[PDB]
Design a protein around this ligand. Structure first.
Ligand SMILES: *CCC(=O)Nc1ccc2c(c1)n(C1CCN(Cc3ccc(-c4nc5cc[nH]c(=O)c5cc4-c4ccccc4)cc3)CC1)c(=O)n2C
Length: 410
């Protein structure tokens, strides 16, 4: 019964390269709102929540451009926005009503700040901030997302239900940073995420310069297990897989972080173009604001695992316009000290075309789990943490502060 409600050409502002791009968007009755470079010829795959307009607020703005409408959604613990533009105000009204109608159709179905000690600002965003905190009672480390309540819910009662549910709805996968607490103030919504104390993966990789293929296989296997979970259970694309979002716990297992917030990019002055963060890890289809899916995360896996085994980023250049081209056009090269199994995996994961990318098919993660690089790996044992970590972080417990002291200056 899944059908198209409305379709046509729109102008979508880039999510990382913030410029207006002509896209053909499809609005469906299941809530999906997806744009393409060209209107597609053709479904069988399960829908992705990244494109859902369910439980979202629509806003009509004349800034930065007239006839602009925005779809703002809270997805898990991050407030995201998709900005669109049409030619006439009448055309905007038709889209907004349609989207709202679909969203309405899907509608039908004590922790306080005093308990935490402020430690350090982790990041700032448009709709809030993320800080490193320590629960006074236990001494545990947490990342607290502090978001503006206005941009999320209009009622305190609905926000309270959101706080209760997010904790219960919390996915229990060993390699994802769990949402531990959720509470609200008078004007702020707070998400308390667990913070690994085993050190950043960029820190560990920087010190030992390069990981062995065995050690990279371990980390890679745990990442695959996590991504498989998000895709098949939560039906969501992570889209943030990079070295900076990987940490180790006290035992040496991978933790994929959820500490990010949506920001306004930094204007460079180079043709006055705004860029959001750094693009070295971005998948080609994402960089071009094209249609994207689960294959994005496998590109991310390729990027991460490339750097672990090679000791450098797959694509790098000081100029962004050149860096874009390397990501979009240049073939990936490998060191001659890299084994054939590793090269096969990396080349497959770093395919330019997501439809041809390893794990890009309908079988998703299973295509990667069956790859010869992960031969011998018992994937049930990976999820159950039966695999012993090749590196044991120098910490006595979960409250050990070594990777929070002047030891990481090295
Ligand atoms: C340039 C800065 C910026 O913000 N750019 C930008 C622009 C537009 C965006 C952006 C970003 N995003 C982000 C894409 C990355 N995701 C990361 C993320 C994905 C998924 C989860 C997550 N979701 C869950 C949903 C439901 N149940 C769950 O259990 C979930 C668990 C997780 C999770 C994943 C890893 C670790 C812990 C939990 C979290 C983060 C954030 C938004 C974007 O969407 N748009 C449009």
């Amino acid at each position: 019964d899944v059908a198209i409600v409305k379709e046509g050409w729109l102008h979508k502002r880039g999510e990382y390269i913030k410029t207006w791009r002509p896209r053909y968007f499809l609005l469906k009755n299941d809530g999906t709102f997806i744009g393409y470079k060209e209107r597609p010829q053709d479904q069988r795959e399960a829908p992705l929540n990244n494109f859902s307009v369910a439980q979202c607020q629509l806003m009509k703005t004349e800034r930065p451009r007239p006839n602009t409408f925005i779809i703002r959604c809270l997805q898990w613990t991050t407030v995201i926005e998709r900005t669109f533009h049409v030619e006439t105000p009448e055309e905007r009204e038709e889209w907004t009503t349609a989207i709202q109608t679909v969203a309405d159709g899907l509608k039908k179905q004590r922790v306080t700040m005093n308990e935490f000690e402020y430690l350090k600002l982790l990041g700032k965003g448009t709709f809030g901030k993320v800080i490193l905190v320590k629960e006074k009672a236990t001494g545990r480390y947490y990342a607290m997302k502090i978001l503006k309540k206005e941009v999320i819910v209009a009622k305190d009662e609905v926000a309270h239900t959101l706080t209760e549910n997010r904790v219960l709805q919390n996915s229990r996968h060993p390699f994802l940073t769990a949402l531990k607490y959720s509470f609200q103030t008078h004007d702020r919504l707070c998400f308390v995420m667990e913070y690994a104390n085993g050190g950043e993966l960029f820190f560990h990789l920087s010190r030992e310069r390069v990981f062995s293929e065995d050690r990279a296989r371990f980390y890679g296997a745990e990442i695959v297990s996590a991504l498989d979970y998000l895709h098949s259970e939560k039906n969501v694309v992570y889209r943030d897989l990079k070295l900076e979002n990987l940490m180790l716990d006290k035992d040496g297992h991978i933790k994929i972080t959820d500490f990010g917030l949506c920001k306004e990019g930094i204007k460079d002055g180079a043709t006055m173009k705004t860029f959001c963060g750094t693009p070295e890890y971005l998948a080609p289809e994402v960089l071009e604001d094209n249609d994207y899916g689960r294959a994005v995360d496998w590109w991310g896996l390729g990027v991460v695992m490339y750097e672990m085994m090679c000791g450098r980023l797959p694509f790098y250049n000081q100029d962004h316009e050149k860096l874009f081209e390397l990501i979009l056009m240049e073939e990936i090269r490998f060191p001659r000290t890299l084994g054939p199994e590793a090269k096969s995996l990396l080349s497959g994961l770093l395919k330019k075309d997501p439809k041809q990318r390893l794990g890009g098919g309908s079988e998703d993660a299973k295509e990667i789990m069956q790859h010869r690089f992960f031969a011998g790996i018992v994937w049930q044992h990976v999820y159950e943490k039966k695999l012993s970590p090749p590196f044991k972080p120098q910490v006595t417990s979960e409250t050990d502060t070594r990777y929070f002291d002047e030891e990481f200056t090295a």
